[PDB]
């Protein structure tokens, strides 16, 4: 199915580093941190070609039985199809701090002010090769 | 549910370190490396009190739609209910190499000669607090 880390709580102060490989001919893939596949506090989508979006990062949250909220977009896109990537995420109750493969960072609001998350997963056209959550 | 790391391949040469806490009044808990909850190549059960077994490690494999194979048991048991533990696992095509919190080791045959595993999970009376698989 998708690559999942489930019920190993990602809590305030811990760091999550995932590494993987983008597929050749990838459309998009995302890293999702939340509660379930329908309850995502930080959705980070990497769009190689999706609709009108080409080489952009789109960040958003998904509320259970409600839907996607306000998107934030970033133009920082050090990603290449067929290549490796590595991303580190930490958060406090106000902000998710994300660091990309090249050291550039992107910040996204912790909109629900959650202190722990029990599901981390990747979906779309990429695969994970390692994870550290500590 | 249980603590799971799914579809992030654990391959020949990589190391898996999981850390957690044993519940107070724990009966037993296990760390399972395999393909599914019905297909486990290395089952490591930690028995505080289970039947006639008290403070013993039991290792075995579970074959899909067949069942448990020959058990191997170890008397090394540096575990205390309510306390933390940390375990490191690597394997080659013949052997799973397991290192316990106190540095003692236990070895178990890789009975199917598998080179990669797509499910790592914990079940029973413990919880995981961190994982590194790299
Ligand atoms: O916001 C994350 C969310 O985006 C959806 O796509 C949006 C698209 O970004 C937007 O430009 C357009 O107006 O509406 C689309 C549908 O809501 C994705 O479908 C979804 O998977 C998430 O990635
Ligand atoms: O071997 C792992 C497997 O053990 C089962 O328990 C065994 C028990 O170890 C043995 O002494 C007894 O004779 O038979 C029991 C049932 O097969 C557990 O039930 C199972 O969960 C695994 O842990």
Coordinates of C-alpha atoms and ligand atoms in Angstrom, one line a residue:
Chain A
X1 CA 0.0 0.0 0.0
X2 CA 1.7 3.3 0.9
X3 CA 4.6 3.6 3.2
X4 CA 3.3 4.1 6.8
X5 CA 4.7 4.6 10.3
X6 CA 1.6 4.1 12.6
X7 CA 1.2 4.4 16.4
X8 CA 4.7 5.4 17.2
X9 CA 3.7 8.9 18.5
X10 CA 5.5 11.8 16.7
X11 CA 5.5 14.3 19.6
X12 CA 6.6 17.9 20.3
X13 CA 10.3 18.0 20.3
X14 CA 11.0 14.8 18.3
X15 CA 12.5 14.9 14.8
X16 CA 11.3 12.8 11.8
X17 CA 13.7 12.3 8.9
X18 CA 12.5 10.3 5.9
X19 CA 14.5 9.5 2.8
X20 CA 13.3 8.1 -0.5
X21 CA 13.4 8.1 -4.2
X22 CA 11.0 10.0 -6.6
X23 CA 9.7 7.7 -9.4
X24 CA 10.6 8.4 -13.0
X25 CA 7.6 10.0 -14.7
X26 CA 6.2 11.0 -11.3
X27 CA 3.1 13.2 -11.3
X28 CA 3.3 14.1 -7.5
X29 CA 3.8 12.5 -4.2
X30 CA 3.2 13.7 -0.6
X31 CA 4.4 13.2 3.0
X32 CA 1.3 13.4 5.4
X33 CA 1.5 13.7 9.2
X34 CA -1.8 13.3 11.0
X35 CA -4.2 11.0 12.7
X36 CA -5.6 8.9 9.8
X37 CA -5.8 9.0 6.0
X38 CA -8.8 11.4 6.4
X39 CA -7.3 13.5 9.2
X40 CA -4.0 15.1 8.2
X41 CA -2.4 18.0 10.0
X42 CA 0.5 18.6 7.6
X43 CA 0.1 17.5 3.9
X44 CA 3.2 18.4 1.8
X45 CA 2.6 17.6 -1.8
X46 CA 5.4 17.7 -4.4
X47 CA 4.0 18.5 -7.8
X48 CA 6.1 17.7 -10.8
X49 CA 3.1 18.0 -13.1
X50 CA -0.4 18.1 -11.6
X51 CA -3.1 20.1 -13.5
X52 CA -1.6 23.5 -13.9
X53 CA 1.0 23.0 -11.2
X54 CA 4.6 22.2 -12.3
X55 CA 7.5 22.0 -9.9
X56 CA 5.8 23.5 -6.8
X57 CA 5.2 22.4 -3.2
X58 CA 1.7 22.7 -1.9
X59 CA 1.1 22.5 1.8
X60 CA -2.4 22.1 3.5
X61 CA -4.4 20.2 6.2
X62 CA -7.3 17.8 5.8
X63 CA -10.1 17.8 8.4
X64 CA -12.0 14.6 9.0
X65 CA -15.3 14.5 7.2
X66 CA -14.8 18.2 6.3
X67 CA -12.0 18.5 3.6
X68 CA -8.9 20.4 2.6
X69 CA -8.4 23.9 4.1
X70 CA -6.3 26.9 2.8
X71 CA -3.3 25.8 0.7
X72 CA 0.1 27.4 1.1
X73 CA 2.5 27.0 -1.8
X74 CA 6.2 27.2 -2.1
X75 CA 8.3 27.7 -5.1
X76 CA 11.4 25.9 -3.4
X77 CA 11.7 22.7 -5.3
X78 CA 15.1 20.9 -5.2
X79 CA 13.6 17.6 -6.4
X80 CA 14.3 15.6 -9.5
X81 CA 12.4 12.6 -10.9
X82 CA 14.3 9.3 -10.5
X83 CA 16.4 10.8 -7.7
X84 CA 16.8 10.7 -3.9
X85 CA 15.4 13.2 -1.5
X86 CA 15.7 13.6 2.4
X87 CA 13.3 15.7 4.5
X88 CA 13.3 16.5 8.2
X89 CA 10.3 17.7 10.1
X90 CA 9.9 19.0 13.8
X91 CA 7.1 21.0 15.2
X92 CA 6.0 23.0 18.2
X93 CA 2.3 23.8 18.9
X94 CA 2.2 26.7 16.5
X95 CA 4.5 25.6 13.6
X96 CA 5.8 22.7 11.5
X97 CA 9.4 23.2 10.6
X98 CA 10.4 21.4 7.4
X99 CA 13.9 21.2 6.0
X100 CA 14.5 20.0 2.4
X101 CA 17.4 18.0 0.8
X102 CA 19.4 21.2 0.0
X103 CA 19.0 22.8 3.4
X104 CA 16.2 25.2 2.4
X105 CA 13.3 25.3 4.9
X106 CA 9.5 25.8 4.7
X107 CA 7.3 26.5 7.7
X108 CA 3.6 25.7 7.9
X109 CA 1.1 26.5 10.8
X110 CA 0.1 23.7 13.2
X111 CA -3.5 24.7 12.7
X112 CA -5.1 22.5 15.3
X113 CA -2.3 23.1 17.9
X114 CA -1.8 19.3 18.2
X115 CA 1.0 18.0 20.4
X116 CA 1.4 14.4 19.0
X117 CA 0.6 12.5 15.8
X118 CA 0.1 8.9 15.3
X119 CA 0.3 8.4 11.5
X120 CA 3.1 9.5 9.1
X121 CA 2.6 8.2 5.5
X122 CA 3.7 8.7 1.9
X123 CA 1.4 8.5 -1.0
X124 CA 1.8 9.1 -4.7
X125 CA 4.8 8.5 -7.1
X126 CA 7.7 8.0 -4.7
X127 CA 9.0 5.3 -2.3
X128 CA 10.6 5.6 1.1
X129 CA 14.0 3.9 1.8
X130 CA 14.7 4.9 5.4
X131 CA 13.1 6.7 8.4
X132 CA 14.3 8.0 11.8
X133 CA 11.7 9.2 14.3
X134 CA 13.3 10.0 17.6
Chain B
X1 CA -3.9 -0.7 16.8
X2 CA -0.3 -1.9 17.1
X3 CA 2.8 0.0 16.3
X4 CA 3.6 -0.6 12.6
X5 CA 6.3 0.4 10.1
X6 CA 4.9 -0.8 6.7
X7 CA 6.3 -0.7 3.2
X8 CA 9.6 0.9 4.0
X9 CA 11.7 -2.2 3.1
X10 CA 14.0 -3.6 5.8
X11 CA 16.8 -5.0 3.6
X12 CA 20.0 -6.9 3.9
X13 CA 22.6 -4.6 5.5
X14 CA 20.2 -2.1 7.1
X15 CA 19.8 -1.7 10.9
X16 CA 16.5 -1.4 12.8
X17 CA 16.6 0.1 16.3
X18 CA 13.3 0.4 18.2
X19 CA 12.9 1.7 21.6
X20 CA 9.8 1.6 23.9
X21 CA 8.4 1.0 27.3
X22 CA 7.0 -2.3 28.8
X23 CA 3.6 -1.9 30.4
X24 CA 3.1 -2.4 34.1
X25 CA 1.5 -5.7 34.6
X26 CA 2.6 -6.8 31.2
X27 CA 2.0 -10.5 30.3
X28 CA 4.2 -10.4 27.1
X29 CA 4.8 -8.3 24.0
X30 CA 6.6 -9.1 20.8
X31 CA 8.6 -7.5 17.9
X32 CA 7.7 -9.1 14.6
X33 CA 9.5 -8.7 11.2
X34 CA 7.8 -10.2 8.1
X35 CA 5.5 -9.7 5.3
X36 CA 2.1 -9.5 7.1
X37 CA 0.5 -10.2 10.5
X38 CA 0.2 -13.9 9.2
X39 CA 3.6 -14.1 7.7
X40 CA 6.4 -13.3 10.2
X41 CA 10.0 -14.3 9.6
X42 CA 11.3 -13.3 13.0
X43 CA 8.9 -13.3 16.0
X44 CA 10.6 -12.3 19.3
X45 CA 8.2 -12.7 22.2
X46 CA 9.1 -11.3 25.7
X47 CA 7.3 -13.4 28.3
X48 CA 6.9 -11.9 31.8
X49 CA 4.2 -14.4 32.6
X50 CA 2.6 -16.5 29.9
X51 CA 1.3 -19.9 30.8
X52 CA 4.3 -21.7 32.3
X53 CA 6.8 -19.2 30.8
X54 CA 8.2 -16.5 33.1
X55 CA 11.0 -14.2 32.1
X56 CA 12.0 -15.9 28.9
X57 CA 12.5 -14.8 25.3
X58 CA 10.8 -17.1 22.7
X59 CA 11.8 -16.7 19.0
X60 CA 9.9 -18.4 16.1
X61 CA 8.6 -17.8 12.5
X62 CA 5.0 -17.9 11.4
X63 CA 4.2 -19.3 7.9
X64 CA 1.2 -17.9 6.1
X65 CA -1.8 -20.3 6.3
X66 CA 0.5 -22.8 7.9
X67 CA 1.4 -21.7 11.5
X68 CA 4.3 -21.4 14.0
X69 CA 7.4 -23.4 13.4
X70 CA 10.1 -24.6 15.8
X71 CA 10.5 -22.3 18.8
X72 CA 14.0 -21.3 20.1
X73 CA 14.1 -19.9 23.6
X74 CA 16.6 -17.7 25.4
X75 CA 17.1 -17.2 29.0
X76 CA 18.6 -13.6 28.5
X77 CA 16.0 -11.3 29.9
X78 CA 17.2 -7.8 30.8
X79 CA 13.6 -6.4 30.8
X80 CA 11.5 -4.9 33.6
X81 CA 7.8 -4.1 33.6
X82 CA 7.2 -0.3 33.5
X83 CA 10.7 0.3 32.1
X84 CA 12.3 1.3 28.8
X85 CA 14.0 -1.1 26.4
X86 CA 16.0 -0.7 23.1
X87 CA 16.7 -3.5 20.6
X88 CA 18.7 -3.5 17.4
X89 CA 18.2 -6.0 14.6
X90 CA 20.3 -6.6 11.4
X91 CA 20.3 -9.8 9.2
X92 CA 22.0 -11.5 6.4
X93 CA 20.4 -14.4 4.4
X94 CA 21.2 -16.9 7.0
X95 CA 20.9 -15.1 10.4
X96 CA 19.0 -12.4 12.3
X97 CA 21.3 -10.7 14.7
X98 CA 19.6 -9.2 17.7
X99 CA 21.2 -7.0 20.3
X100 CA 19.3 -6.3 23.6
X101 CA 19.3 -3.2 25.9
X102 CA 22.3 -4.5 28.0
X103 CA 24.4 -5.4 24.9
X104 CA 23.7 -9.2 25.1
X105 CA 22.9 -10.7 21.7
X106 CA 20.7 -13.5 20.4
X107 CA 20.8 -15.0 16.9
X108 CA 18.0 -16.7 15.1
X109 CA 18.0 -18.4 11.6
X110 CA 16.6 -16.6 8.6
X111 CA 14.6 -19.7 7.8
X112 CA 13.2 -18.6 4.4
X113 CA 16.5 -16.8 3.3
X114 CA 14.6 -13.6 2.7
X115 CA 16.5 -10.5 1.7
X116 CA 13.9 -7.8 2.5
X117 CA 10.9 -7.4 4.8
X118 CA 8.0 -5.0 4.4
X119 CA 6.3 -5.0 7.8
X120 CA 7.8 -4.5 11.3
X121 CA 5.3 -4.3 14.2
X122 CA 4.9 -4.6 17.9
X123 CA 2.0 -6.4 19.5
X124 CA 1.1 -7.1 23.2
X125 CA 1.8 -5.2 26.4
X126 CA 4.4 -2.6 25.4
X127 CA 4.5 0.6 23.3
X128 CA 7.1 2.0 20.9
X129 CA 8.6 5.5 21.5
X130 CA 11.1 5.7 18.6
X131 CA 12.4 3.9 15.6
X132 CA 15.4 4.2 13.2
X133 CA 15.5 2.0 10.1
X134 CA 18.4 2.9 7.9
Ligands
LIG1 O1 -4.3 21.5 -1.0 C1 -3.9 20.1 -1.0 C2 -4.9 19.3 -1.9 O2 -4.9 19.9 -3.2 C3 -5.8 19.3 -4.1 O3 -5.8 19.9 -5.3 C4 -6.4 21.2 -5.4 C5 -5.4 22.2 -6.2 O4 -4.2 22.3 -5.4 C6 -6.1 23.5 -6.4 O5 -5.2 24.4 -7.1 C7 -7.4 23.4 -7.1 O6 -8.0 24.6 -7.2 O7 -8.3 22.5 -6.4 C8 -7.7 21.2 -6.2 C9 -8.7 20.3 -5.6 O8 -9.1 20.7 -4.3 C10 -5.5 17.8 -4.3 O9 -6.5 17.2 -5.1 C11 -5.4 17.1 -2.9 O10 -4.9 15.8 -3.2 C12 -4.4 17.9 -2.0 O11 -3.1 17.8 -2.5
LIG2 O1 6.5 -19.8 19.2 C1 5.8 -18.6 19.2 C2 4.4 -18.7 19.5 O2 4.2 -19.4 20.8 C3 2.8 -19.6 21.1 O3 2.8 -20.3 22.3 C4 3.2 -21.7 22.4 C5 4.1 -21.9 23.6 O4 5.3 -21.1 23.4 C6 4.4 -23.4 23.7 O5 5.2 -23.6 24.8 C7 3.2 -24.2 23.8 O6 3.5 -25.5 23.8 O7 2.3 -23.9 22.6 C8 1.9 -22.5 22.5 C9 0.9 -22.4 21.4 O8 1.5 -22.8 20.1 C10 2.0 -18.4 21.1 O9 0.7 -18.7 21.3 C11 2.2 -17.5 19.9 O10 1.6 -16.3 20.1 C12 3.7 -17.3 19.6 O11 4.3 -16.5 20.5

